[PDB]
Amino acid sequence: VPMHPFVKALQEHFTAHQNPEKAEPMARYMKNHFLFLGIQTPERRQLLKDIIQIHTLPDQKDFQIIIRELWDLPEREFQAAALDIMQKYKKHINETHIPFLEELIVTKSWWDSVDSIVPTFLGDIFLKHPELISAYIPKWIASDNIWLQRAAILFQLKYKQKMDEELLFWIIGQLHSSKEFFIQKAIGWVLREYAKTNPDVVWEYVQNNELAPLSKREAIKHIKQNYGINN
DNA sequence: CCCGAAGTCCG
DNA sequence: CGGACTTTCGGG
Numbered sequence: 001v002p003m004h005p006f007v008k009a010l011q012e013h014f015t016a017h018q019n020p021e022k023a024e025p026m027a028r029y030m031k032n033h034f035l036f037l038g039i040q041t042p043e044r045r046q047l048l049k050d051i052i053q054i055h056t057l058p059d060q061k062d063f064q065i066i067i068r069e070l071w072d073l074p075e076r077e078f079q080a081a082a083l084d085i086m087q088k089y090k091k092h093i094n095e096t097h098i099p100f101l102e103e104l105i106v107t108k109s110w111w112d113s114v115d116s117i118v119p120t121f122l123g124d125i126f127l128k129h130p131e132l133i134s135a136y137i138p139k140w141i142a143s144d145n146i147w148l149q150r151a152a153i154l155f156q157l158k159y160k161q162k163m164d165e166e167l168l169f170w171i172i173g174q175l176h177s178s179k180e181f182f183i184q185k186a187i188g189w190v191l192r193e194y195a196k197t198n199p200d201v202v203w204e205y206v207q208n209n210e211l212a213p214l215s216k217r218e219a220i221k222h223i224k225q226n227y228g229i230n231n
Numbered sequence: 232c233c234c235g236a237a238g239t240c241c242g
Numbered sequence: 243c244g245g246a247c248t249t250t251c252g253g254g
């Protein structure tokens with residue numbers, strides 16, 4: 001069975017505009033976990049738009065197929081384009097897609113893909129269906145996979161006043177002893193972000209609960225101005 | 232335009 | 243450890 005023609009067309013068009021000179025630093029930035037074609041986001045977006053204009057966006061019946069086929073291509077720009085394409089099918093994504101999104105998180109995993117899946121696609125799903133959080137979050141925290149652990153921390157990133165504080169702090173408590181940078185930093189990020197909504201609660205939490213030094217420092221990067229730094 | 236959100240390099 | 247500094251991206 002041949003590659004979906006939309007994916008084949010995207011692959012041809014991206015490859016025709018590859019930049020090996022830019023690809024080397026782009027790959028280094030991701031610690032050489034991936035090959036790159038060397039195409040940065042503004043051009044990558046336009047090349048995708050070109051193919052949509054010529055071929056049209058595929059029927060929704062092929063949405064998951066398109067994403068998987070792009071996920072399986074070696075160069076990282078194809079996963080970035082896959083995420084761009086998933087946004088175009090946003091109105092068709094629902095709670096039944098959580099396992100599909102899980103599988104994207106744990107394949108070709110790095111912060112650039114995971115941080116574009118979790119606070120947006122998964123965040124929106126669990127905002128609408130909070131009763132499903134406990135069907136996934138405990139497993140993610142218990143898993144050996146640091147990207148599922150990061151997903152548990154960051155899916156509420158953008159919730160603002162809809163933040164479940166008890167849940168957030170319970171999740172952070174479960175993961176606060178992790179020595180993994182991407183967990184310590186995720187804890188720092190979600191606390192820093194939620195502090196924009198409720199600084200008093202974040203300040204009290206970080207002053208009175210154990211956190212990795214990196215997590216605490218990132219959490220209070222801004223709000224330490226509001227409370228001061230005691231001698 | 233601005234500002235706020237991984238990486239290297241150094242003490 | 244944390245500060246200083248870097249480019250790239252998204253949002254205002």
Ligand SMILES: Cc1cnc(N)c2[nH]cnc12
Pocket residue numbers: 236237250
């Ligand atoms: C995630 C992140 C944070 N801070 C910066 N100054 C960055 N530059 C590029 N990505 C960045």
